[PDB]
Amino acid sequence: NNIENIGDGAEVVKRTEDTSSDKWGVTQNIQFDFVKDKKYNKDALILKMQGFINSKTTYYNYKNTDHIKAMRWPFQYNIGLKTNDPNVDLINYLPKNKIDSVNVSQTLGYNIGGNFNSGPSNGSFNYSKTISYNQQNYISEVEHQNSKSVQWGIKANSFITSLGKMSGHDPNLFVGYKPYSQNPRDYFVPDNELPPLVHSGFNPSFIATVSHEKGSGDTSEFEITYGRNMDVTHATRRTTHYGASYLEGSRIHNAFVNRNYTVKYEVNWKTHEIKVKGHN
């Protein structure tokens, strides 16, 4: 069963939708939890956005050269949610503020009568939903928000390198130790020195709660966007008088923006059925 009783005259109807795109290298695992409460004057839906966004980190030689090689990597991950229904309002979302901690763990609590809150380090609520994601060396913040939308940016922040502390904008970030190699991968730091968000990808965990005016319409559409913004780091071999060789990085910041996989979902407030309307 996917209907749980949260109190007297209150229940949560649970539904899940799963979609993947080889085109974008994204998996969207969406949880739709319908809040059915007699003591609450509105229809409510808790959306838990999970899945996977591949880093799509690629290493390649620069043109017809042997001494310039490149690394294309995700500077920022994009997580967005929007609605086109005038009768639907975005009431809350998690995370709400700029957060730089390695693990982002937050809880949304629900109490009968339409009361929504956030839990610390515990329950006691009638119903609750929890987010958990790792963002090592990255920072999360809300880029854009209103009553119909919320957009997050999980961007490169601070790194501990062999040359000391580096920002996500440092041109020498990720530059390797093998200038005489012919493999573009060797011009860049090994995977054990790369954060998971660069070597593998991102495992999102985001929450958004929407309120629908009762009887205003049976259906509502939601667009969920998962993607990334790519940077290109070029590592040129040098050359010094003494004879020793080293690598030097130059950067094309925001070389490939909004490499996003957008899925349009249809929700039925009466039957609690989910339909995938379309995608890209």
Numbering used by the authors: 2 to 122, 126 to 284
Quote the study that presented this structure, word for word.
Five mutants (Y181A, K182A, H245A, Y246A and N248A) were partially affected. LukS-PV mutants Y181A, K182A, Y246A and N248A also had a significantly decreased calcium entry slope, from 65% to 75% of the control (p<0.05, one-way ANOVA). The T244A, Y246A and N248A mutated proteins crystallized in identical conditions (50% PEG 200, 0.1 M MES-NaOH, pH 7.50). The corresponding crystals belonged to the P43212 space group, with similar cell parameters (a = b∼94 Å and c∼308 Å) and 4 molecules per asymmetric unit. These crystals diffracted X-rays at medium resolution (2.50 to 2.80 Å). In the case of the rim domain, wild-type LukS-PV and mutants T244A, Y246A and N248A displayed only small differences, with r.m.s. deviations comprised between 0.20 Å and 0.30 Å, whereas the structure of the rim domain of the Y184A and Y250A mutants were markedly different, with r.m.s. deviations of 1.10 Å and 1.28 Å, respectively, when compared to the wild-type LukS-PV structure. Residues R73, H245, Y246 and N248 are specific to the two proteins, whereas Y184 of LukS-PV is replaced by a histidine residue in HlgC.
